[PDB]
C-alpha cells in the first residue's frame, strides 16, 4: 500500500535481426520537479542482459541490489559462472516477474514497469515486460508508460510483426529508437533530453551508450506562431 | 570421576573442552590445504585426493568463494566446511545489504569465529 515518489518515465525497446536495443532517459522526477538529472535506469546484468526500469526510483534501486545479488549468488560453487551456467535473460526475467507478482499479492508492490532485453545463449533475442501487478508480455517492440503511447506506434512501423525482425538492421533499429526518444522529449512533460541506450547483439555483444542527447530538433516553425486564434502580431 | 568428554560444552578438570579437541583430530585426518599471503593478495591451495580413476578430473572443486573477494578452503569433514561457508555467505550478504561496502576480511573472520565458537557453548 504505497505511492511513488521519485520516478522515472519511459523505457523503450525493440528487437532487430541480431539483437535488441533498449533506451531510457536519465531523469528522476519528484512530481513535476525534474529533480535528478543523472539517473541511470538501464541496468546491465552480466554481458547479455539489460533491464530497463521506469516507476519509483527507490524501488528501482532495490531491484538493482537484487540483480547484483543474483550475480554474486550464481557464481557460488559454480565453476561455469562465466560460461555455460551464466545468467540468461530468461532467468533474470522470470526471477523479477516472480518478485513483482509476489509483492503485488502482498499488497505492497514495487511500483515499477520493467523491460528485460537480452540475448539468450543460443542467439535468440529476448524482450519481455513485467510491471507492478505481475503482468507480463512480449512483443517485437515494448515500451512503458508514456512511450507505450508514442514510441510503440513509431517502432511498430519498422517491425510490425515477427517476420519483420529478420529484415531489420541495428542501424535502422537504433535510428528508430533515437527518433522515438526525440518525440518523447517533445511531448512527455516528464522527459529529459539526456538518455542512455543499450544494444545487445549476438555477435558484437553488449554495447552500452551513455550520455546521449536528443539532437536534430525542429523548433524553428515556432517563430511564425502568434496568439491563439486572431492575434496578428 | 570421568565422562567429561561425552558432551560438548563441558569443562574438564584442567579447563579443556574435549569435544572440540576431538574435532581437531578429524581435521588432522584430512587433506592439507594452505594459504600464503603476498605483497597485495592471498593464494589458496589444497590437495585433493584421487580415491579412484572414476573421479571426473577437475570437477569436485573444493575451494569456495564468499561474496566476490574472499576465498575459503578447509581440511577435515568437507560438509562441515560447506556449512561454515554457507553461513559466511549469509553473513557477508547481511553486511553488504546494510553497509553497501563488501565485507572487510577482519570482520568476516570474526563472523566465522563467533559462529564456530557458538558451537562450543552447548
From Swiss-Prot, chain A:
Q: Where in the cell is it found?
A: Cytoplasm; Nucleus
User: GO biological process annotations for this chain's record?
Assistant: proteasomal ubiquitin-independent protein catabolic process; proteasome assembly; proteasome-mediated ubiquitin-dependent protein catabolic process
Return the InterPro entries for the record.
Ntn_hydrolases_N, Proteasome_beta4, Proteasome_bsu_CS, Proteasome_sua/b, Proteasome_suB-type
PROSITE patterns per record: PROTEASOME_BETA_1, PROTEASOME_BETA_2
| Pfam families xrefs | Proteasome
Question: Domain of life here?
Answer: Eukaryota
Key word Zinc-finger present in the record?
no
Signal peptide start and end residues:
none
| Keyword annotations from UniProtKB, A to Z | Cytoplasm, Nucleus, Proteasome
Is the Nucleus keyword given for this protein?
yes
- A single GO cellular-component term on record: proteasome storage granule
Q: Which PANTHER family match?
A: METALLOPROTEASE TLDD, PROTEASOME SUBUNIT BETA
The free-text function statement in the UniProt record for this protein reads: Non-catalytic component of the proteasome which degrades poly-ubiquitinated proteins in the cytoplasm and in the nucleus. It is essential for the regulated turnover of proteins and for the removal of misfolded proteins. The proteasome is a multicatalytic proteinase complex that is characterized by its ability to cleave peptides with Arg, Phe, Tyr, Leu, and Glu adjacent to the leaving group at neutral or slightly basic pH. It has an ATP-dependent proteolytic activity. PRE3 and PRE4 are necessary for the peptidyl-glutamyl-peptide-hydrolyzing activity.
Q: Which family does it belong to?
A: Belongs to the peptidase T1B family.
The subunit structure is:
The 26S proteasome consists of a 20S proteasome core and two 19S regulatory subunits. The 20S proteasome core is composed of 28 subunits that are arranged in four stacked rings, resulting in a barrel-shaped structure. The two end rings are each formed by seven alpha subunits, and the two central rings are each formed by seven beta subunits. The catalytic chamber with the active sites is on the inside of the barrel. Interacts with CIC1.
Q: Relay the record's extra comment.
A: Present with 16900 molecules/cell in log phase SD medium.
The name of this protein is Proteasome subunit beta type-7
Lineage of producing organism: Eukaryota, Fungi, Dikarya, Ascomycota, Saccharomycotina
Curated annotation (Swiss-Prot), chain B:
Describe which stretch of the whole protein the shown chain covers, with first residue, last residue and complete length. 5 to 126 of 288
A further note on this protein reads:
Present with 12000 molecules/cell in log phase SD medium.
What does the organism's lineage look like at the top? Eukaryota, Fungi, Dikarya, Ascomycota, Saccharomycotina
What does the function comment of this entry state? The proteasome degrades poly-ubiquitinated proteins in the cytoplasm and in the nucleus. It is essential for the regulated turnover of proteins and for the removal of misfolded proteins. The proteasome is a multicatalytic proteinase complex that is characterized by its ability to cleave peptides with Arg, Phe, Tyr, Leu, and Glu adjacent to the leaving group at neutral or slightly basic pH. It has an ATP-dependent proteolytic activity.
Q: What is stated as this protein's family in its record?
A: Belongs to the peptidase T1A family.
PTM summary? The alpha and beta forms are probably products of the same gene with different post-translational modifications.
Q: Which positions form S-S bridges?
A: none
Q: Tell me how this protein assembles.
A: The 26S proteasome consists of a 20S proteasome core and two 19S regulatory subunits. The 20S proteasome core is composed of 28 subunits that are arranged in four stacked rings, resulting in a barrel-shaped structure. The two end rings are each formed by seven alpha subunits, and the two central rings are each formed by seven beta subunits. The catalytic chamber with the active sites is on the inside of the barrel.
Spell out the protein name for this chain. Answer: Probable proteasome subunit alpha type-7
Instruction: Name the gene behind this protein.
Output: PRE10
Q: Where in the cell is it found?
A: Cytoplasm; Nucleus
